[PDB]
Amino acid sequence: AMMKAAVVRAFGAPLTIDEVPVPQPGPGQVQVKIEASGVCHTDLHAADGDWPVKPTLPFIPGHEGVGYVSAVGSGVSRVKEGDRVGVPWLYSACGYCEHCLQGWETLCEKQQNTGYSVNGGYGEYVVADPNYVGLLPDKVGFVEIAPILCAGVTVYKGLKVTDTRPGQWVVISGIGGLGHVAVQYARAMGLRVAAVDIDDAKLNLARRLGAEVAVNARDTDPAAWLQKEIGGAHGVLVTAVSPKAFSQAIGMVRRGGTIALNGLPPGDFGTPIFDVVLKGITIRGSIVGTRSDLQESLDFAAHGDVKATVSTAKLDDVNDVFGRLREGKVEGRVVLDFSR
Amino acid sequence: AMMKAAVVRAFGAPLTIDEVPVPQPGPGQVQVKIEASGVCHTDLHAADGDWPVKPTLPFIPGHEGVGYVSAVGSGVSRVKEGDRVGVPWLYSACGYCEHCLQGWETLCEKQQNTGYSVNGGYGEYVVADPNYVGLLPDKVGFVEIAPILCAGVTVYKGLKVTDTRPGQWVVISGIGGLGHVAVQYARAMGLRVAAVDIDDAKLNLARRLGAEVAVNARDTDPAAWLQKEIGGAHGVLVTAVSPKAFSQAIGMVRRGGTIALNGLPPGDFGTPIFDVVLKGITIRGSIVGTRSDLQESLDFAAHGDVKATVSTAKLDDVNDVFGRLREGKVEGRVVLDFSR
Amino acid sequence: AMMKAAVVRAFGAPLTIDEVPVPQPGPGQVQVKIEASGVCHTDLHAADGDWPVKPTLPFIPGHEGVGYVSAVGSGVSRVKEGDRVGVPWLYSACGYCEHCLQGWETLCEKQQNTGYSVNGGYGEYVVADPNYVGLLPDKVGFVEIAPILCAGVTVYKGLKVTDTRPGQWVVISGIGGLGHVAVQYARAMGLRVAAVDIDDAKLNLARRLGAEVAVNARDTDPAAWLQKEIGGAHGVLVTAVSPKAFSQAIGMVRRGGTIALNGLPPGDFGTPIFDVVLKGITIRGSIVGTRSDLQESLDFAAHGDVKATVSTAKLDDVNDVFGRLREGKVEGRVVLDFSR
Amino acid sequence: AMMKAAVVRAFGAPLTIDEVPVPQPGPGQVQVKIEASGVCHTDLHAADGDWPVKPTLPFIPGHEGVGYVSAVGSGVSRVKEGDRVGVPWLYSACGYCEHCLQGWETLCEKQQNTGYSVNGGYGEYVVADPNYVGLLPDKVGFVEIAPILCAGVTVYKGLKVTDTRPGQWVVISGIGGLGHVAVQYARAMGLRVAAVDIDDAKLNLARRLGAEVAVNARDTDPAAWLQKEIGGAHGVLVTAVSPKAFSQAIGMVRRGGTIALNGLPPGDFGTPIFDVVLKGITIRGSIVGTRSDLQESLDFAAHGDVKATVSTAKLDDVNDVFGRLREGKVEGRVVLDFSR
Numbered sequence A, B, C, D: 001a002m003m004k005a006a007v008v009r010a011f012g013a014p015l016t017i018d019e020v021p022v023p024q025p026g027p028g029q030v031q032v033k034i035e036a037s038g039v040c041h042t043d044l045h046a047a048d049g050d051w052p053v054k055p056t057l058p059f060i061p062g063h064e065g066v067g068y069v070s071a072v073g074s075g076v077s078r079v080k081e082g083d084r085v086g087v088p089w090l091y092s093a094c095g096y097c098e099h100c101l102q103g104w105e106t107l108c109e110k111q112q113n114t115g116y117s118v119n120g121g122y123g124e125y126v127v128a129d130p131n132y133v134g135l136l137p138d139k140v141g142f143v144e145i146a147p148i149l150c151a152g153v154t155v156y157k158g159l160k161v162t163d164t165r166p167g168q169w170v171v172i173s174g175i176g177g178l179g180h181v182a183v184q185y186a187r188a189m190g191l192r193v194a195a196v197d198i199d200d201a202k203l204n205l206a207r208r209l210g211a212e213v214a215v216n217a218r219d220t221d222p223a224a225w226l227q228k229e230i231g232g233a234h235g236v237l238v239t240a241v242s243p244k245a246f247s248q249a250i251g252m253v254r255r256g257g258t259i260a261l262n263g264l265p266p267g268d269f270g271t272p273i274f275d276v277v278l279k280g281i282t283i284r285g286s287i288v289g290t291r292s293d294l295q296e297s298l299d300f301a302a303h304g305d306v307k308a309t310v311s312t313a314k315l316d317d318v319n320d321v322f323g324r325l326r327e328g329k330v331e332g333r334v335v336l337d338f339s340r
């Protein structure tokens, strides 16, 4: 009837670990006993209110929560008790609007978002819509599979809308939580990978995961450096948390190329309209992934083409994590482990 | 042997109409007798030499020249004497690079541009690369058709890359020189047209052209109004690329929609990352088009679907024409008449 | 503190899944919480007690058990709690006898064997000697690395003792648990691989894994076939579970070749002395691998050169699994899943 | 032009001493005038033609012929007329194949064998390939050195391939024609020698030759006695390969040890898989040796470390010699003496 859970109550203030009531699945709902729970940079963005539309206080964050179905509301037909599932950013959608009908539920205006508009995986249990949960492969442990619930599907989908094809060069900008799995998805999709970040250790993580080439934007110029090394990229995926770089990216691509954007730092970035028009460049925002995207991203994980580099932490360690994530001191992803 | 031509000998200085030697077609080249020559703002930028890469002096502007093939060099098979052809912005391309081989010759690094990097149609005669000239429909007069070489293909290709389809909504931002042509192309492409400008006259014209909706941004926030009314436009064509138009386009576009930019404004534009990523927006640069694009845009004119607003002027009065353009006194397009 | 475990109580009898006391780490010992546990055919040999030296009844089998160190006895230095480790056939050696001093601890007459002379990994927990455990790479999941603890290390060392070198031919007889990863190690060691088995699906597996040539022993005499096809092999590794395969292997090598033996079916095989002597043939038994062998064989898996073909099963179904393995219905390895 | 020689004209029939022409050397060949000619059991099998591959009829046996170079063909530099040479089992090899290029001429597919596939030293003269003759030491009589061409190099190479080091234990199984020479080589090679036989006389000879330990398998189990006593032997040389000696060898040998087989018995021997594998035992066939092996074996005799037990007989009495051989009446080795 009661559960441990990390709750946000003030934008900018440390999360408190409290013992709140356990959510109960009504008709058409399910309950999930959380086994592991990934920490996304989005969680930071939320807890501080970096965004135009802010979460409602108080709430439990976490949209990379994974575990077992521990209760099944009325008439649930897609999942049964004991099912291995995850609860991603896209908590639910309406299912019949133009977006939803075209398989673009990620754009649904009636969508609810896990760990934001509704409570998420930073708790021992969480109620979910069984129609939008990720169905997890048994062969991958909860801790390893957790980051795929967002970092994975996001960059998988991001790479898809770069409109690049096998044999072509793609640039991953920002080799962090999203970045480091993006390199892996790219290679599995037959692409050649170039990497850029501000820390040489993150570039080395990239090189190990498959990237053929890397650059430190802090050193010399990333764009210019890339035009010389590979003759510009066919595509670019931006997972960086800095507005600048959202600008340097437009210069790393060859004419007719496409830059896909995953990062969500507040503010604008400078777009050279003249060159964009003259070089026929495409800039494209990519928001997480649909249910099919998610299932496919999970499939890559299942086959071992993608393995997330994760650090373990305890629910109680929540705030220590946030700090180091802000400090850019995290290698890959941090995952809260509930295994008591 | 000798011909009259408008010549730029010093950037910024009023053109002088000089008697100059009629250019002769060598092997693989043809000669064209100009009957009409389109004028547009691009010609101002070539004359002022105010773009990042300047024309070489001296030179003859004009990339909307049309007339008859009056002489054919050796090894030419695409056209013959008497053929009615146009010499558009894309004078030539290398034909072997990645872009050229993939049908994107407009992105060719080695391309030459009529009335900019080589002499153009502000003269009685012009030499052209037969592989890159436009094949004019007999159905349409020289004056009427000239603007289609530039304004026509630009907005047409711009509409194509909005990845919209018949039945869907498109916003035509700016109903001026390009805009009033874009409306007609949009209608012929089965699109529902929403017209946006600040000029009541231009909006009335848009309505007369078949625009289903017309919003004056002076009195009404088009972004807010369109979202409320139609949930946004699947596609947005920005024919007048000001920061205000760019920002508003991002506000007007439906989630997952596409914005095509037809202009070449100076400076960096501020681009809101959050909106672009969350809304899954595509931003795409597009000016003029490939040889295929041009032929297709020409066919719409031939079939009576598209008719440019045009007035004529004499070669001797081009400086006055440049005057009207700079002061924005031109409704539609001005076309130099070379016919006797 | 109790735990589930598959126990052999009588030779030839079905194993029973009993509740048994959790083994505690004495001084110099550590406790391992099993996450996965590979099923080796040696386990069937033990449960049936068909070797001259029987295991003591009762006993828990399993020498491919992997997991996290869950407890540390006094005086342990080699590893710490949380460490990823595996417990191989060679549970421990005396450390100071002639064999141990020369790095051949696999020959120690005072050695203990996991899942044979001491309890193994068919249980939730296993106590182990930290000086002899496998130190697992983070890169590889428990399910996939499990077969390396014996299947991998055994055939890797076996291939080493064939005295073959890069470019030369090696034959793998019996493409089962050991055989199918042997093919992979062979390739990683620069050898050309030939495959022999009595099942087409097995040989198709070998072909997928890099076998340059393959032949079904049931369809033709494999010795004659290989002599004709590749001119005889420089080396053979025998991992088959039938004595006939041992006899046939001796005829597969070219003069001066080496046959290494991993397989352990009961009984004798026919050694043609005359030919062995005249042709200067070497026949060599190879028993699992040393700690050095194990570490190196693990490195090959971490780098992606070797990936075990694995299907998971539950502790409860260990008897059905033994059955399928007995009748040769398993493709690759079966690994018991102990994860949450 | 004619000479006397013992000739096999029908398999199994008694040999006849016939008058045949002296074989004359052509280019690259030399002629040897026999002073002594060793006899062994291989000569019996040649005369009986009971081996898988038979001699061609008719032919003169003898692969242990020693004497002076009495004539040379053109292009001979390794030896000159007057040189004391022996004509061993390996008459010649192609010199180009994979085996020959690797110093393993004994494995050459196109090899010819003296007194088997080509005429041998059972005659007054014999033609040889100077590139393959043994170069005899000045200080050892012909009669005494003859057996080294076969028995000598056989047990020497045999001992070498056991891969035993000075100081280590080696078992000489069977102290007969080969065994009694093997004991001496083993001691010269710094090995500790354990002798095994079922004959007290032979075992007493072993002790006389430096055998540190002697055990009669008739009275006591040599395997048990040796494992208990010295911990098993690092190496075992089986010079009389019966199934018994073979199986006892597997028992006597230390774990990771090597068993070398010198005999050529018929049929397949039952080989215990469990023992060979678990003990990490090497079983290796070895008879005669390479040209370097032979020169090395000859050096030992020259230095007085090895002296064969020899009894002389006349050419005319070869049939009687074959008789005593067949009846196992020969102590040591019998050598035909062609001296004045």
Ligand SMILES: NC(=O)c1ccc[n+]([C@@H]2O[C@H](COP(=O)([O-])OP(=O)(O)OC[C@H]3O[C@@H](n4cnc5c(N)ncnc54)[C@H](O)[C@@H]3O)[C@@H](O)[C@H]2O)c1
Binding pocket: A039, A040, A041, A042, A045, A150, A151, A154, A173, A174, A175, A176, A177, A178, A179, A196, A197, A198, A199, A202, A217, A239, A240, A241, A242, A244, A245, A261, A262, A263, A264, A265, A286, A287, A288, A289, A325, A328, A332, B277
């Ligand atoms: N569209 C989507 O749904 C998608 C999905 C979740 C991630 N988000 C966002 O994506 C961003 C990244 O996600 P994350 O969890 O991996 O954050 P992260 O902290 O794990 O990784 C960020 C990386 O960006 C790097 N970086 C910072 N400045 C840089 C620069 N100037 N150039 C290059 N690299 C730079 C850091 O080194 C770090 O490696 C976050 O803003 C997050 O909110 C959106």
Ligand SMILES: NC(=O)c1ccc[n+]([C@@H]2O[C@H](COP(=O)([O-])OP(=O)(O)OC[C@H]3O[C@@H](n4cnc5c(N)ncnc54)[C@H](O)[C@@H]3O)[C@@H](O)[C@H]2O)c1
Binding pocket: C039, C040, C041, C042, C043, C045, C150, C154, C173, C174, C175, C176, C177, C178, C179, C196, C197, C198, C199, C202, C217, C239, C240, C241, C242, C244, C245, C261, C262, C263, C264, C265, C286, C287, C288, C289, C325, C328, C332, D277, D278
């Ligand atoms: N000496 C050691 O170091 C080594 C290590 C452990 C494994 N063993 C033994 O190795 C053997 C194999 O292990 P496993 O787990 O891979 O068993 P397995 O059942 O997985 O594989 C056995 C394979 O042998 C094949 N086979 C059967 N008859 C054959 C024939 N006549 N010719 C060719 N192939 C034939 C089967 O098709 C099968 O593919 C077992 O006996 C096991 O006990 C010893």
Ligand SMILES: [Zn+2]
Binding pocket: A040, A041, A042, A043, A063, A089, A150, A151
């Ligand atoms: Zn996220």
Ligand SMILES: [Zn+2]
Binding pocket: A093, A094, A095, A096, A097, A098, A099, A100, A105, A108, A109, A110
């Ligand atoms: Zn919807």
Ligand SMILES: [Zn+2]
Binding pocket: B038, B039, B040, B041, B042, B043, B063, B064, B150, B151
């Ligand atoms: Zn123009």
Ligand SMILES: [Zn+2]
Binding pocket: B093, B094, B095, B096, B097, B098, B099, B100, B105, B108, B109, B110, B111
């Ligand atoms: Zn080109």
Ligand SMILES: [Zn+2]
Binding pocket: C040, C041, C042, C063, C089, C150, C151
């Ligand atoms: Zn095993």
Ligand SMILES: [Zn+2]
Binding pocket: C093, C094, C095, C096, C097, C098, C099, C100, C105, C108, C109, C110
């Ligand atoms: Zn030991």
Ligand SMILES: [Zn+2]
Binding pocket: D039, D040, D041, D042, D043, D063, D064, D150, D151
């Ligand atoms: Zn002999």
Ligand SMILES: [Zn+2]
Binding pocket: D093, D094, D095, D096, D097, D098, D099, D100, D105, D108, D109, D110
């Ligand atoms: Zn040869």
